Amino acid sequence: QPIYWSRDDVAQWLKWAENEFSLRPIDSNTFEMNGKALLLLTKEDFRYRSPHSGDELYELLQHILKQIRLPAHLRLQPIYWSRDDVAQWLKWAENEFSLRPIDSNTFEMNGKALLLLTKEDFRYRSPHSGDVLYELLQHILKQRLPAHLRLQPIYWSRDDVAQWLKWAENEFSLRPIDSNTFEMNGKALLLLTKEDFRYRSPHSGDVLYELLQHILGLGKKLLEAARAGQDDEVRILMANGADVNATDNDGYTPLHLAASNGHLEIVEVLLKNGADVNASDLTGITPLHAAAATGHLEIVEVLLKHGADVNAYDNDGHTPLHLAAKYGHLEIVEVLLKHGADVNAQDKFGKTAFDISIDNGNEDLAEIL
Numbered sequence: 001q002p003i004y005w006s007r008d009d010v011a012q013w014l015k016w017a018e019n020e021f022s023l024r025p026i027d028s029n030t031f032e033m034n035g036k037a038l039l040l041l042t043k044e045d046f047r048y049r050s051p052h053s054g055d056e057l058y059e060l061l062q063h064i065l066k067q068i069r070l071p072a073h074l075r076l077q078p079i080y081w082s083r084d085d086v087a088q089w090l091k092w093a094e095n096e097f098s099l100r101p102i103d104s105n106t107f108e109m110n111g112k113a114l115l116l117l118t119k120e121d122f123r124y125r126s127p128h129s130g131d132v133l134y135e136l137l138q139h140i141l142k143q144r145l146p147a148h149l150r151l152q153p154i155y156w157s158r159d160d161v162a163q164w165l166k167w168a169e170n171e172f173s174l175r176p177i178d179s180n181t182f183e184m185n186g187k188a189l190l191l192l193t194k195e196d197f198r199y200r201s202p203h204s205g206d207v208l209y210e211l212l213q214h215i216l217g218l219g220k221k222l223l224e225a226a227r228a229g230q231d232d233e234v235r236i237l238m239a240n241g242a243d244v245n246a247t248d249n250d251g252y253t254p255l256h257l258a259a260s261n262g263h264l265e266i267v268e269v270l271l272k273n274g275a276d277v278n279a280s281d282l283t284g285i286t287p288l289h290a291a292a293a294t295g296h297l298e299i300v301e302v303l304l305k306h307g308a309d310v311n312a313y314d315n316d317g318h319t320p321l322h323l324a325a326k327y328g329h330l331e332i333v334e335v336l337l338k339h340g341a342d343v344n345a346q347d348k349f350g351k352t353a354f355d356i357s358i359d360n361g362n363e364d365l366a367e368i369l
Contacts, residue, residue, distance in 0.1 A: 100128035102133070223238065
């Protein structure tokens with residue numbers, strides 16, 4: 001059975017299939033592992049290794065299949081692995097699966113940071129044994145912020161970004177990070193792609209990038225379901241602790257989602273528990289911008305009451321009034337005007353709010369006065 005195969009046995013199976021199925025020739029270095037390691041690999045890992053014939057090789061192994069043992073020093077959970085423990089795990093799995101010699105510098109981090117890395121980060125660090133060193137962790141996993149930076153990353157300062165790095169270095173046992181590695185503001189740090197993080201900090205940029213993603217949002221991912229209106233679940237989530245200013249994959253806070261779905265109970269409890277009433281969506285949309293278009297006047301009055309920029313502008317230069325006038329909501333438009341809405345909507349096409357009401361044929365909204 002393939003479980004008993006060695007690196008030599010794996011390689012012979014490759015040259016056999018290369019002749020039997022007339023696959024494009026592949027170097028034995030493509031799969032330098034024992035049969036136990038090969039099993040841990042997913043079909044996507046087979047594809048990445050030998051693109052020309054990885055698919056069929058995987059299916060062959062599966063067709064052949066149809067016809068733990070962690071050291072005591074590393075028996076603890078990976079979240080508690082120190083940086084030294086990770087090195088032994090790399091060296092042990094190397095001898096356990098007969099892999100290419102993994103350098104200790106490959107994973108210069110604690111056990112928590114190792115969990116933050118995605119499968120791709122493992123592959124970049126260990127191009128010869130990363131996938132095996134990744135799925136093994138998952139099987140092991142199956143077996144058994146500082147107050148100075150508690151603000152949302154979008155509002156972090158250049159000095160704040162530096163302290164975040166220093167905190168991350170001590171928190172995840174990372175290598176010394178220079179502060180000039182991310183000499184920018186939190187907004188600029190968000191704009192950087194994961195490839196930029198890997199280039200700025202080759203030792204820890206993959207960890208640092210993922211760290212920022214978690215700060216931007218598990219409990220928050222559940223709390224964002226406040227859009228659905230599960231008020232009791234929102235209280236329960238906040239009671240357990242959650243970033244009230246979390247951001248989804250499109251950059252929406254629980255407030256954005258609750259305001260757009262008409263949950264004044266949620267729209268008020270989030271503000272009381274610390275919600276950015278003027279939070280800027282990726283499109284520059286504010287909670288008011290959302291509530292105005294969705295016609296939730298009560299939420300509109302609340303946001304304006306709890307401090308909302310009646311004259312904010314999205315990425316297309318649209319004020320809440322413009323969004324209101326685009327969907328009628330003359331009542332909401334009146335509230336915005338009563339709270340100091342700009343008559344010059346200053347649209348990206350220069351259109352004013354009245355101009356939007358004229359194109360929509362809403363004479364009542366056009367009759368602003």
